[model samples]
Target: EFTKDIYHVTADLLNVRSESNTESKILGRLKKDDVIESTNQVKDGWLQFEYKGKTAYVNVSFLSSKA
Candidate 1:
């Protein structure tokens, strides 16, 4: 079974990166309260997911499960 976990952007602006690193290319920005689905992969403080048809990473610190 596959489950999709939803996370809300907790910061004013969160960067969606190409890779799980600060120096990686930023694909886009997610504004506060923006909803995102996770692939359930988290490594080194980053969460992996599909965004806008591409695999992307965002800092876990900037994401929240709460509404």
Candidate 2:
């Protein structure tokens, strides 16, 4: 399920290393100020959001709640 509240990167954002197991791989990265609208949780620790139209992950560790 998707939530309405916005989420910001808590640290120097790491990119999804692959389409699968996004939690394990950190390839390219996003800057700290990157903001994303969460769309859905693909799995327990995986989320689907737009990284410039293509879907990306904001793993459980990389995300924190917005105030």
Candidate 3:
């Protein structure tokens, strides 16, 4: 079974990148209070989330998980 986690965007604005780094292309953006489903994976301080059926990334520092 696959496990997924829900995270909330805590930053005023967060970029959803094509890859796990700031230099990667931006896939989109998420604002504070925006919630997203994560793949439960983190790479180089980046978090994995899906966008338009493709894997996308966000800076882990700007996301929070609620109990």
Candidate 4:
């Protein structure tokens, strides 16, 4: 979906974590070509967003803005 806060995945298989930390549990994985729409928030190097009806944190590599 197109949105102002849409984010793109840089890594081939980005891990969606329960917490922002790397040691947190990996809830799921995101495909590289998938785009995400989320609110504005970033902690340290982690970006928290809701995906697949659940809230999770992903690494901040692609801060792609809407065109």
Candidate 5:
């Protein structure tokens, strides 16, 4: 469950993407109340998260830690 409130971008614009990589088709946006769980990145500055059972990527900048 989400323990805080904040908005985040669901696409690469909110984070970092590989330089030679092609952009992905945006599935949709996630609201502030949504909960996010991610696995540690295999690369630097990237995070892998599960959204609705599918794996997704978001850069560190995309997350806003709540106080």
Candidate 6:
């Protein structure tokens, strides 16, 4: 069973990446207080989630559990 969790963007501008690596392609950008749904999957200090109907990752440091 897969469960999703909500996270808030804590940065003024957060880059959503195609992969967990920082050098990965930038899928898009998220703004502060933006709400996102994550699978709670973390890799290489990044969290996995769906963005624009595609899988993407964002730096864990810029996300908060509180929305």
Tens-place lDDT per residue, model 3, 1-67, is 7366788889999999998888999888889999888756676888777888888888889988532
Sort all candidates by TM-score, best to worst. 1, 6, 3, 4, 2, 5
Candidate 2 — which residues are off by over 4 angstroms?
Answer: 1-3, 22-28
Which residue pairs does candidate 1 place in steric collision? none
lDDT of 3: 0.82
Scored against the true structure, residue 55 in model 3 reaches a CA lDDT of 84
lDDT, candidate 5, 1-67, per-residue tens: 6443333543344522333122864444554434455434434655566555666665544555522
- Write the residue-wise lDDT of candidate 6 on 8-64 in tens digits: 888899999998877899999999999788756666788888899988888888988
The positional error of residue 50 in candidate 4, measured at the CA in angstroms, is 0.9
Choose the strongest candidate by lDDT.
Answer: 1
lDDT of 1 at 24: 88
Q: What is the TM-score of each candidate against the true structure?
A: 0.86, 0.61, 0.83, 0.76, 0.47, 0.84
- The candidate that wins on TM-score is 1
lDDT of 4 at 52: 75
The model with the greater TM-score, 3 or 4, is 3
Could you give candidate 2's per-residue lDDT for residues 1-67 as a string of tens digits?
A: 6556576777786565446464554545766767667646547766666665565665756766652
Give the higher-lDDT candidate: 2 or 5: 2
Please list the C-alpha lDDT of all candidates, in the order they appear.
Answer: 0.86, 0.62, 0.82, 0.75, 0.47, 0.84
Global lDDT of model 2:
0.62
lDDT by residue (1-67, candidate 1, tens digit) is 6477788988899999998898989999999999998757677888889989998889989989623
Q: Show pairs that collide, candidate 5.
A: none
The candidate 2 region of ten consecutive residues with least summed lDDT is: 16-25
State model 1's lDDT.
Answer: 0.86
